Structure formats: C-alpha cells, structure tokens
Amino acid sequence: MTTADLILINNWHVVANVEDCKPGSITTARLLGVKLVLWRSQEQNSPIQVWQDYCPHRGVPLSMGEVANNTLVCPYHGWRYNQAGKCVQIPAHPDMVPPASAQAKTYHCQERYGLVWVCLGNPVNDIPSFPEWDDPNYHKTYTKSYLIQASPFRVMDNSIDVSHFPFIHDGWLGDRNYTKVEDFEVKVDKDGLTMGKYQFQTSRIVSHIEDDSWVNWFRLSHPLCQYCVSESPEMRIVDLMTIAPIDEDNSVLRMLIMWNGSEMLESKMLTEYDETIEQDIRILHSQQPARLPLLAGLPQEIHVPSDRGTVAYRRWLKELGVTYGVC
C-alpha cells in the first residue's frame, strides 16, 4: 500500500502532536503504507526519532521494545539501536562488531508548530508556512485527531469546497436561506492552489450574533495541508489543517487553530470545529468512488462554477503526478 508518487514520498507529513511524545516514550504511526515508530530518550529536550517500525534481525516491531538510555531496545533478542539507528549492542555476542546491516530504517523528522513532521524520502520542499504561529496576538488550540475512512485527497477536496456550507453546516457556517455562492477567484501557480477572498453569510458561535458576514481565503502549497484564514470585522481566525495519508483509503485529519481574540473563546472554537468536522466526515465516509476522481459504471462528476476551486484541485493533482488515492 505504498506510493512511488514523489510529491508524496518526498514531502513532509504530520504524524503526531509533540505533546504526545514524552521523553522516554514510544509511540506508533502509519504513513503512506509504512509503519512508523516514534521514540525519545529520557533526557530533557531529547530529539524525536521516527523509524520504520521493524527490527531487521527477525522482523519484530521495534515499538514493542523499550527505551534504555539513548537507545531503543528490541524485545526479542535485545539488540540496541542508538539515536542514529545503528545497532550498538548485540547481547548474545557482546564483543562482536555489529554488521553494517544492523541498522534501523530512519526517516527525516522535524518538530514545527508543535507537530511532528516526517519525510519518508528526500525532502525537496519545506514544511508549509504558518505565519501566525510566531504572532503573540494569536492564541492557539489543537483539535483532536480525526480518523476518516476516505482517501486523503477526498478529505482535502471537501475542505476546499465552499458551496456545501449552507447545507451540511446549516446553522454553523451557512444559512439555508442564503444558499447562493458569491463569485470568487482561484489560482494554481508557484504558490500552489490559492482560493481568493470568498464572502459568505453566517453568524458563528465564536463571535457576536450580528457579526454575520465572514470572508475566507486559503492556500495549499502542499496538496494535503491547507492554510485557511477566516475573517470578520470583529475577529480573525487562521488554521493549519493537515491530512496524514495513512493509506489510499484512510486519513488522519488534524487542525491547529489560531485566533486574534480572547483566550476565553477556546472552548467554543473547539466546539464549532468538532461540530463541522463531524458533519463533513458523515459526507466523506459516504462518497463513492473512494478515490478522488480527477478530471476526464458510475456517472462522471458534474462541475458548476462554484466548483472552480475543487476543479482546480483535481487539475493540480494531475499536474503534480498524483496517482495514490485518486482515480
């Protein structure tokens, strides 16, 4: 269940929140069909290692082992792997020089925005930018992680779509009485995919009742991360959505939300996002085919003008060479 797609293999993907990787801890993740083990030594400020979850001796998951000092120890015969992935001790043969092949498969890892980013290949692109991270005007919160039984590209398709707001988000992000979708612009260029400012009508639980005209904007430099800005005259909310491609048919959605208003709004922010993410997931789980259809049994997709963003997304994925999770 792996991919040759270099835009996917040679890119950075979130696999965990840094808060879930304590010193001395072992955790697991799955990315693009590969089983990962994440571990840290007990030392303060220890780096996070992200390896293939696999002991090359007899094929046991290293995640079933234990962290000892600065090493991860396999449970079956106790081979110890240092932070660089090299076996430094074979207990049955304490004096031998361990073979060069006694080495875990290691991956590039980088903590950014409080998230653990992993690259399984050779990183040609940087981690997506998130300018408000360093802005002290902005408070932050993290949603829980949502496991979704849909293609990661269908999950992103739904997050680019704006015309569904008055229907599945009626009463939250739209209003069954204002269903018309105002004109907006979309561009695919060196910045990636950008949806220009899009105004829509709704009151929101995180603001005042009369603050009922919102304007959204977003950019994907990476096909599975979205930087979204939602702004009213009273408040500005930004978020970094990341979709972890577990395999072709399963995804993990995470959202890092920041806002330039009272820190007291955090509970309402998480409530709104939980409500709307779950409304989206009900649709996502139902869509067929599972793979995202690109532009070209079941009838072909129909496109109307307010689909210009999701059409541009399908065009972009084709231009990027994506074959994983798309059809």
Added chain:
Amino acid sequence: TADLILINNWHVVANVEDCKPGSITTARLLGVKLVLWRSQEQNSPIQVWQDYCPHRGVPLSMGEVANNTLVCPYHGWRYNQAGKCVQIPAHPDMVPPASAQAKTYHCQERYGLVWVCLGNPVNDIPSFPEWDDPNYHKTYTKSYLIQASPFRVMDNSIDVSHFPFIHDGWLGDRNYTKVEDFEVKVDKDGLTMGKYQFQTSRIVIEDDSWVNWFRLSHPLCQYCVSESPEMRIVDLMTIAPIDEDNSVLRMLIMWNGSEMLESKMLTEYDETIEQDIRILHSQQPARLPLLAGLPQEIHVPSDRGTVAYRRWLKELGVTYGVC
C-alpha cells in the same frame, strides 16, 4: 454486474408497506444501490433510482424529500420525480446542466410488493392468480437476509427430497423418506414441477396428504400451490439478488381457509425457512454449480427438478451467482 436475463427482469426489492408517503428507503439489487422515495401526496408513486448524486457522489438516500423532489444533503441539488435536477442552490438562476440527472429505474407496485427492473422490461411481472380471489386471505412473511447465492436459495426451494430430514415434523416424515416419481418440464412458460404427494400433517390434522406443484416463469420467483382436501395454500416466493453471494427472501402466502390461521401460517413458514437457511449458509461453494478441490455434484432421480433448474440457468445464459 449481472447478465441481461437478470437485468431485464422484474425483482421485488421491498413491500409497499415499507414505503410510506414522504419516506426514503434503500435497497440493493444485482450490486446496484437503490434509493426508493415518495412524496407526501396521497397515493404518490414510488421512485426507484440509483442511490447516487452525480455532482460529488453522495448517496441521495442521505437527503430529504421536499414537496415533489428529492434533495441531496451535500450541496442541496433538487431532483424532480423524473430524476432531473431542477435547482442548483449555489447558482439559483442557472439552468442545471442536462447531465444533472439521477439514474432512474422502472418500478411497479403489484401484489403489495415493489417490483424493479434495472434494464428494459421485456418480461411481465410473474402471475399470481389468487391475488384478487375473494375466497383467499393473504399474509406476508418478514424478509430474510440469506448469506447465499440467490440461485442456491432457489435451488433449495425447488428441492423436494430434503423434507423428511431438515423439515422433519413440518413438511416431511423421517419414516417416509422415499420420493415418489414426478415430472418436470422446462418450456417457454419457464420451469414447472408436476404434482407430487408427500405424507405429512401441517399445523395449518388427519389432513396428512398434500399435493403440491410449482412454476417458475422467472429464475428467482416461484409460484407454489399446496392443496389438501381441506384447504388450498399458494405462495409467491421472491428472491432478491443483492449480489452474487447474498439474497433477500420474501413470501406472499394466500389461503382459502379461515383468516384466523394467519399466525400459525407465519410460524410454519418461519420454522421451515429458518431450517433451510441453516443449510444454505453452510453449502460450499457459495455460488450454484451448473452441470460441470471439491468434487462435482452428484444427481439422483429425485434431483430431476434441481437438475432441470441448472440446465435452465445455462440455457438462459446465467453467469452471475453461479459457478
């Protein structure tokens, strides 16, 4: 995807009582997901469509009926009774594209059942002559979901020699196991099994001689007649072919005795159906073997009806749910 003999035939997918005005229900037929819906209007017709919005591929059954339209939950496109999209809410003054239309199927209500044809209905719905006979009362069994090929289910319903064993004490007698000779005929009226007698009393009592015959004009529907000196019982058994390996069995039962026998009737059928299902779920392979690992089937003279069934399916060019 099934053969054209199955595609161009009528299959029961629901009881008309399952489909109230304003309601949405679902069914599956020959691998196709179906949505059934009715407006709120009195005596409104049932629409049966493929359960699929062509915009972004959401099941229309997750939507709602509004007036005389079905509305998709995702972006609110509205489909009239003919399946044409009449409104795209994001663009209220835009004429919907001609491609914006649900795939619709033929639907007819008959005998209180919802019949569907996914193709072109060359054949008629099977006949059921007792339906309008004022001497006969009617009842419907519940539907039975069966994890077996629909053609295995029908094979078991054509089989008569198993009565003294898995229906001992209901349709057969373990002391009377011999199967007297009978005639079977396959012609343009389908498969008919001639009269055959089996010595057993039924709960529907010295009435222990029943003469049965049945006809299939349609490989997945069976019209069964059972008559004693005291009473005549007929039934229409319909097998909905969900896919190659799964079936829904329904029976419509009519009888010319007292209507107070209904509860006992439903119990007899429930008992014998579940006795059959226990065998059906166990048979291997799952798909019905036609005439020519696991050994080939063996046929004895009392299998002539189930042998003729397999020959008929081959003549009709059935490849779906058979092996």
Added chain:
Amino acid sequence: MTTADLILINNWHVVANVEDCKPGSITTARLLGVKLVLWRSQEQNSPIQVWQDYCPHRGVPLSMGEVANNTLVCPYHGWRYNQAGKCVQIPAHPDMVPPASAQAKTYHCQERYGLVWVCLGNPVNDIPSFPEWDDPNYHKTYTKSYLIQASPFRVMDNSIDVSHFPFIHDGWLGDRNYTKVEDFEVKVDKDGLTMGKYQFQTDSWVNWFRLSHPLCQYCVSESPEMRIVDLMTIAPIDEDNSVLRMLIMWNGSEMLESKMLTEYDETIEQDIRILHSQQPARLPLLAPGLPQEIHVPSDRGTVAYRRWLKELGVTYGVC
C-alpha cells in the same frame, strides 16, 4: 489455501487429541487448507475416521450430520456413509445402489502417543519417534492447543531459536543478567536437524533437540534432579495460521504436572506475543519493502533450519 509440497502433503500431522474424540462424536479440524471431519461410531474402541468435511451430493459439511450406528448421516437429504466412506443408503431411493461416486474423500489416520495423526497424501514418512513414551518411569501430560496467527514455519523457527531466552523468557528460561550465548553445534543430515547440547546461565538445565519432521520437534532438557522430554507438534492450518501442541514427559514426581503446565503456558504465550507481530508472516528463507534478515553466530540453528527447508523444497508458509 492448499499446497503441493510433498514434504507437507505426504507427511503426518497432529490434528486432535484422542481424548477429544469420544465414541459417537463428531469434531472438526483444518489441515493445509482442507476442512476435516473426524468421527467415531458409538461402539467401544471404534476407529477414528478423518474425511474431507463435505457431502458430494449438494455440498453440505458432513460435520453437521449425526452418527448412526456405524455410519455418518448427512443432515440435508440423509445420505449414509459407512466407516470406509462409501455411501450405503440414499433414503429418497431406498432400494437403489448409490452411484459409485457417492463416497467421502477419506484420509489416512493413526492414533499415536495419544494424538490423532493425519496424512492427506501418500504416507511416505513415518510418524516421528518418541522414545520415552514406552518408558514406565516417565509421566505424561498434554498442553491445551494454541492457535497462533503465524506461519507454522515461523512458529518452528521461534522454537529452534535459543538466544531470545533472556529477553522474552526472563525469569523462566533465561536471565537478563546472562545474555551471552555460548557456542553450540547444529547438524542437518538425513535424520533431519539436530541441535547439540546447550545450557543457559541463570543447577542449570542442559538441553538438545531434534527435528526429523520440519513441523515436529523432540526436545530434551536435563538437570541433576530430573529429565523432561517433549514432542512439540505444529499443525499447519494454512500458510499463515498454526496450532501448537506439546506432549510433555518427565521422570520426577507426578505431582509436578500443574506447575509444568503453567510454566509451559507462560513461555508459550511469551513466544506467541512475538510470533503474532513478526513481519513478513511467512518465514524468509536464505538468499532471496522490508530488508533481508540478519544472522549472527547464535542464529546457527535457525539458519540451518532455513537451509533445510530450501533443500526440502518447502514453498508453503515461507517466502
């Protein structure tokens, strides 16, 4: 999934314990992808029949039927099959001689060591030897069966492996303080695979074992106090699933049985935790997106096992 490997099809495999097959009983098992029915008539000391679990009339499992006198009766139309597998009676036609094809597929069965051994092919090899069975100084006990979601050859590989004792069997077969594995000898010849004497420092137990059958292991463990032998059998359900049984004999007091069963239960379950996790599921042989296995000197027995399986031509459950 079935195999053509002759070392597997033409060999004997344990499918049941004899005490599990009482007179008049019907039980089921799977072997090498085949569904089996085991049955016995009600008469005393009746033989055990082992057939493919399949009525050739309409494909019903015979195991859903009943034993009547000396016959197994299919539940659907009541065809009666005698102890040789021949259909003797078709009740729809009481006076008819059944078709010659009306016959169960029967397999060779033999009771030995209190176990039911089955050969699905041509018995070329004999059942493995177990000398202490005939020794009145030795008591016997049987573990329960263990269903393991791993290739049977992975299960046997783990049983030949000795260097894992201080880690997953710390406190039972090894000691985390003594992890170095001393030199030992292994031989593969016509008698199969023999591991020579080795001892684990935790007085100490001295052990050796032999496989003449690639899925059966004869183990010997000796300390100054007593001697324990066991016959470990691994039934290959399919390429990815196994049933582990042990027949244990010892010449100490009979009262040790309960503790020994618990010790075996503890260590078997420690092994199963590893076996269920190993990837790939099939045992990798030598010299063929996961890296290839690494071997150190203390792996000499499991290396010799992989070499043996290749020369035996095993393709089922290996990769």
